[PDB]
Swiss-Prot record, chain A:
It comes from Saccharomyces cerevisiae (strain ATCC 204508 / S288c). The lineage of its organism: Eukaryota, Fungi, Dikarya, Ascomycota, Saccharomycotina. Belongs to the eukaryotic ribosomal protein eS8 family. Ribosome biogenesis protein NSA2 subfamily. This is Ribosome biogenesis protein NSA2. A motif (Nuclear localization signal 2) lies at residues 32-39. It is found in: Nucleus, Nucleolus. Component of the pre-66S ribosomal particle. Interacts with NOP7 and RRP1. Interacts with RSA4 (via WD repeats). Involved in the biogenesis of the 60S ribosomal subunit. May play a part in the quality control of pre-60S particles. Under normal, rapid growth conditions, high levels of NSA2 would allow the progression of pre-60S particles through the ITS2 processing. Present with 8660 molecules/cell in log phase SD medium.
Curated annotation (Swiss-Prot), chain B:
InterPro entries: Ribosomal_uL11 (IPR000911), Ribosomal_uL11_C (IPR020783), Ribosomal_uL11_C_sf (IPR036769), Ribosomal_uL11_CS (IPR020785), Ribosomal_uL11_N (IPR020784), Ribosomal_uL11_N_sf (IPR036796). The modification Phosphoserine is found at residues 18, 31. Belongs to the universal ribosomal protein uL11 family. Present with 68500 molecules/cell in log phase SD medium. There are 2 genes for uL11 in yeast. It holds the Pfam family Ribosomal_L11. It comes from the Eukaryota. There is a cross-link at residues 123, 139 (Glycyl lysine isopeptide (Lys-Gly) (interchain with G-Cter in ubiquitin)). It is found in: Cytoplasm. This is Large ribosomal subunit protein uL11A.
Curated annotation (Swiss-Prot), chain C:
The gene is NOG1. Keywords: GTP-binding, Nucleotide-binding, Nucleus, Phosphoprotein, Ribosome biogenesis. Belongs to the TRAFAC class OBG-HflX-like GTPase superfamily. OBG GTPase family. NOG subfamily. This is Nucleolar GTP-binding protein 1. Associated with nucleolar and cytoplasmic pre-60S particles. Directly interacts with RLP24. The chain holds residues 1 to 346 of 647 of the full protein.
Swiss-Prot record, chain D:
This is Ribosome assembly factor MRT4. GO terms for biological process: maturation of SSU-rRNA; nuclear-transcribed mRNA catabolic process; ribosomal large subunit assembly; ribosomal large subunit biogenesis; ribosomal large subunit export from nucleus; rRNA processing. GO terms for molecular function: large ribosomal subunit rRNA binding. The lineage of its organism: Eukaryota, Fungi, Dikarya, Ascomycota, Saccharomycotina. Transmembrane segments: none annotated. Present with 18200 molecules/cell in log phase SD medium. The keyword Cytoplasm applies. It comes from the Eukaryota. Keywords: Cytoplasm, Nucleus, Ribosome biogenesis. It comes from Saccharomyces cerevisiae (strain ATCC 204508 / S288c). It holds the Pfam family Ribosomal_L10.
Amino acid sequence: HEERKRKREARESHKISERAQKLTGWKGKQFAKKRYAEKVSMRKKIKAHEQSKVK
Amino acid sequence: NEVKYLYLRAVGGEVGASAALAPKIGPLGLSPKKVGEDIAKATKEFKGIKVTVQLKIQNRQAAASVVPSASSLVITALKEPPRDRKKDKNVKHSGNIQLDEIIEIARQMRDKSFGRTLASVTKEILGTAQSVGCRVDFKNPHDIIEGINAGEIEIPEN
Amino acid sequence: MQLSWKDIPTVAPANDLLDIVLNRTQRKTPTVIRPGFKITRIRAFYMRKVKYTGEGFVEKFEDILKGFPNINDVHPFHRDLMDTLYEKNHYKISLAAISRAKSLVEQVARDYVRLLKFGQSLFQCKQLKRAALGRMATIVKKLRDPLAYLEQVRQHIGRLPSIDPNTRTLLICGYPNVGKSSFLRCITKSDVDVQPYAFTTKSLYVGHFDYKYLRFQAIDTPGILDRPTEEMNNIEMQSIYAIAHLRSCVLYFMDLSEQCGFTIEAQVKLFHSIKPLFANKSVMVVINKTDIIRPEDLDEERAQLLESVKEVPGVEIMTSSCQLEENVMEVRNKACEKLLASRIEN
Amino acid sequence: VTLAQTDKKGRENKERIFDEVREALDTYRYVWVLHLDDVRTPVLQEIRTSWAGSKLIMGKRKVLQKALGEKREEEYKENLYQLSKLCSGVTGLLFTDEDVNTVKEYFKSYVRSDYSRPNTKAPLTFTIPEGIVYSRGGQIPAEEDVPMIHSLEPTMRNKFEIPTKIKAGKITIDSPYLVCTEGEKLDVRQALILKQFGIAASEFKVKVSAYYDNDSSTVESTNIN
RNA sequence: UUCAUCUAGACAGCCGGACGGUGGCCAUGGAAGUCGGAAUCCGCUAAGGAGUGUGUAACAACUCACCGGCCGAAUGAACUA
Ligand SMILES: [Mg+2]
């Protein structure tokens, strides 16, 4: 089921386009908050990696 | 007849672990107690020192020998007493390393060293010592590489 | 509850619980309030919503509070399972923190509803209800760690075999690197590996076999190590605890074979260590691979040590092997007969 | 994204390759040109230890052509254009002034154990006896043999879909399979097989079909297989 | 809009390499990079991280980032409205 797992991972990765609009409302705000948190975490990780590489 | 070549590591002057050596002596059927006695006899030179032990088998004949390792030789170069205490943690020999033992630690590996010249062997050994992190010649190991590069420290070559 | 705690309802992290409670309450509470209303209606609506939120949080906490039993005193004959697994002190600290939060939430709600009873205008009432919600959010966010420990504790206790302390039982223990799970395989049916390792089994295992016209359960010890004789890991400490706090007949195993994990070098230390903890527990001893080690040519130097062991009255050594299906049955039948004789005499 | 300290080299590598090749062109008398494209790092170590009095410097085919001269008008040394299109794959350069016959004999006679996997070959027949598999093909007795792990079974059940002499996962086959035959052209699965256990069925030597002199600085090209 | 790559062959893909000191040191019955904490060098290169992951009990194998060959025009990354 390794192929099934890979397909599941790819579907989860591409599901953001479908998740762009959800419910009749009050869910887009939660999705935006989750995306903002993920972006902040990614930026912090990138900065930490760059600093570690520098020194 | 047939010759079996394998590599194992153990503690000098101690009986080898029968649980670990069971796959090695599985088909052979030799006595693990006899194997441990042979390991102790061959490794009695080094007391409490982790070294490699050979297991040359030809029609199930006991044959063992000791081949050192770089880290173990770095530890044992100072000839400091090796002791194990249940109340002591994170203790290692970090005494100053003179160039007299640097020559010997380069020569012991120079035969099998990839570096063609004694200079290459010495710089590899210096990299290894910097990895280990012990004090050398009352000097920081980090700068000895650039000292060699600039000629600050000369390594005799013959 | 009794020897089976799988009934834990569910666990969610602190943030998830806060979000769930808040959204469920905001969905179930009416959201249409106009300025063209008398103050009584506004007060009633907001009091209803705040008390409903409080009751929802209380009911979300009380179930998990009651699910975990009194680990200090539940089975004092045995006890010492989840502490041995991970820990006890921080577990109780986290549970006490959750309990304190539960005992504070309703007090905060009562005080705030008392304060808001005398509300006057929409602005101030909205501000105070927002303040109440913020207080709830803070007091649920200040317990992120207890839920994290709770999830692990629940997962660990879910896959825990039931053990009946006040019933007939037997125990098997012996030096590792021998294939201890072989006895389990030949006696009962379960899942285990017989790999030529010290740790043939990785946790406690209990059988459900039946012989001598009656049902019995055998407990397998994961292993015994006695290099410091006092300080082990969970694998050995659980085995030693089970041996200590049980009067079930115990079968001890030492591998008297030329091929083993320890050969013949530490069985004397094993006996010395176990003798203080082996007093009135029906000590039984067996040896495997007799048909291939030929016990007929045993050395007298080690026979002296065997005689020294035999000086203790509760010693019986015989020849048996798991490769056949006669010696194992005879040994198990003899163990059952000894158990029956012991319970008849006592 | 990327989460590693290592980054792309850039073009300073190309610049330093140019500098080193142009400066090394004028070190000894006799340059070296050979025909050996695909190699391995232990082999490189062996040849460098053998030829420490030389320089194991090599790079891109295009950059080597640029250094040797893309046109007749520009040339580091006389008649260096014949060495440009001399080889099409990958080859290195050496500066050894030891001998000619000795080095050629060394090339023609040296032989080592490795893997080749050619389209045309005459290999021994390799079979997988019994349902239970082995990682080397069953050469040593089953008493000394060791089992394998079935966790990676989907890999062989999807990419291979056939019993394997080498790189075999724990399954059962009704009949043994002759994974390798004499005078057969290997396919993708066969190329994937016969690599895990390190049993080097291939013998690698030096096939030399190139030469050049600098004092003469003229056209030279041999052909030895 | 800003900063880059590119006939001194880019991004995607197929295939190849990713080695030694060194199973580098404390926890060991386990820590080869991946249950942990410190950990940060060379040897020879064009390239190999005292290692981003898949996961074995460990090994091993795969995989990424970095190079190499195939195909030969524009392409990438972030941000703005
Ligand atoms: Mg077992």
